[PDB]
Amino acid sequence: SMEQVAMELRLTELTRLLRSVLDQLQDKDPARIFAQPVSLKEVPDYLDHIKHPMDFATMRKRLEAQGYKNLHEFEEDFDLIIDNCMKYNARDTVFYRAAVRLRDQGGVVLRQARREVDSIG
């Protein structure tokens, strides 16, 4: 139907906007601490601690599959990256501190993205 095509066009455009957001957010992790999933070969007990792991590569996979239906779904995955890190790692670690910085610097990018998504429809 024409309606389904129009809907798919909107999804494609959302994916394009979210791709830009994702690149901007990942730029705020220059150490690439959150770039890949935590390896069970390196951290064997990780899944005993964290029930819903997330990372930028996994987000990018879901993104390119047009698996984010709205910004809220995207933000919930971004939030997992930060919240998981701030649970698993203690406050005086380079990991926790990177998560704080990513949260702070990313809020700016997400504040604008929320307005843009509301604007464009």
Ligand X SMILES: CC(=O)NCCNc1ccccc1
Residue 103 identity: R
Q: Which residue has the tokens 């698993």?
A: 88
Which residues here bind ligand X, judged by CB under 6 A? 33-34, 38, 42-43, 85, 88-89, 95
From residue 30, give the alpha-carbon distance in Å to each of 1, 36, 108. Answer: 44, 13, 17
CB 41, min distance to ligand X, A: 9
**Closer residue to ligand X in complex, CB, 75/83:** 83
CB 58, min distance to ligand X, A: 12
CB 71, min distance to ligand X, A: 23
**Closer residue to ligand X in complex, CB, 60/117:** 60
**Closer residue to ligand X in complex, CB, 6/35:** 35
- Alpha-carbon gap, residue 57 to 66, rounded angstroms: 14
CB 109 within 8 A of CB 21: yes
CB 44 within 8 A of CB 62: no
